[PDB]
Amino acid sequence: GTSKLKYVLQDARFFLIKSNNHENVSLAKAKGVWSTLPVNEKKLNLAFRSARSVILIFSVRESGKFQGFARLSSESHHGGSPIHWVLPAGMSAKMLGGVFKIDWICRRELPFTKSAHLTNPWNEHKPVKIGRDGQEIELECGTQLCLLFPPDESIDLYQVIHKM
């Protein structure tokens, strides 16, 4: 059902993560990690201490879809290992330093066509698909967006709930 999911999303904060390629989202799904540019790393660190759950909603650029969502389980930390991110043009390993651990809540896709009825007040009420990497999504918009995803029956939210 959706009851444990709603509990995890209660009073959560939500951030849109935009990835330049599928390879890094695949690595994040396999390893439970994410890294972002310093301006967003700072915001997520602040949010992690501020809210019972911080939810990252991932979308690969040009895919027309979201690829799932995950909860931060830690602030960013350095020196743990070199994650082999696929770096775009102008992106460097030092700008992708600082690794967050994440627990996936849903690894299923959601096409943007299905979220067209949701607008984000923190981005001028544009459709929630629209936004820069790191754009915060207001609570009600973000909750509704996450509830639109197909249920991911491979994930047991019991251990997620205990991290809270």
Swiss-Prot record:
This protein's UniProt keywords: Isopeptide bond, mRNA processing, mRNA splicing, Nucleus, Phosphoprotein, RNA-binding, Ubl conjugation
Keyword Nucleus found: yes
Residues with the Phosphoserine modification: S81, S92
Annotated consequence of substituting G68I: Abolishes RNA-binding and ability to influence alternative splice site selection
GO CC annotation: nuclear speck; nucleoplasm; nucleus; plasma membrane
Effect of W34D: Abolishes RNA-binding and ability to influence alternative splice site selection
Effect seen on changing D133K: Does not affect ability to influence alternative splice site selection
Effect of R132D: Does not affect ability to influence alternative splice site selection
Top-level taxon of origin: Eukaryota
Result of changing R132F: Reduced binding affinity for N6-methyladenosine (m6A)-containing RNAs by 9-fold
Domain YTH: 12-149
GO annotation, biological process: dosage compensation by inactivation of X chromosome; in utero embryonic development; mRNA alternative polyadenylation; mRNA export from nucleus; mRNA splice site recognition; mRNA splicing, via spliceosome; post-transcriptional regulation of gene expression; primary follicle stage
Subcellular locations according to the entry: Nucleus; Nucleus speckle
Mutation effect (L56E): Does not affect ability to influence alternative splice site selection
UniProt PTM comment: Tyrosine phosphorylated.
GO molecular function, one term: mRNA binding
Residues holding RNA: K18, S19, N20, W34, S35, W85, D133
Consequence of changing F66D: Abolishes RNA-binding and ability to influence alternative splice site selection
Keyword Transferase applies: no
Outcome of substituting K18L: Does not affect ability to influence alternative splice site selection
Its biological purpose: Regulator of alternative splicing that specifically recognizes and binds N6-methyladenosine (m6A)-containing RNAs. M6A is a modification present at internal sites of mRNAs and some non-coding RNAs and plays a role in the efficiency of mRNA splicing, processing and stability. Acts as a key regulator of exon-inclusion or exon-skipping during alternative splicing via interaction with mRNA splicing factors SRSF3 and SRSF10.
Known partners and oligomeric status: Interacts with SRSF1. Interacts with SRSF2. Interacts with SRSF3. Interacts with SRSF7. Interacts with SRSF10. Interacts with CPSF6. Interacts with KHDRBS1/SAM68. Interacts with TRA2B. Interacts with KHDRBS3. Interacts with EMD. Interacts with RBMX. Interacts with ZCCHC8.
Domains: entry comment: The YTH domain mediates RNA-binding.
UniProt name for this protein: YTH domain-containing protein 1
Source organism of the structure: Homo sapiens (Human)
Gene name for this UniProt entry: YTHDC1
Range of the intact protein held here: 345 to 507 of 727
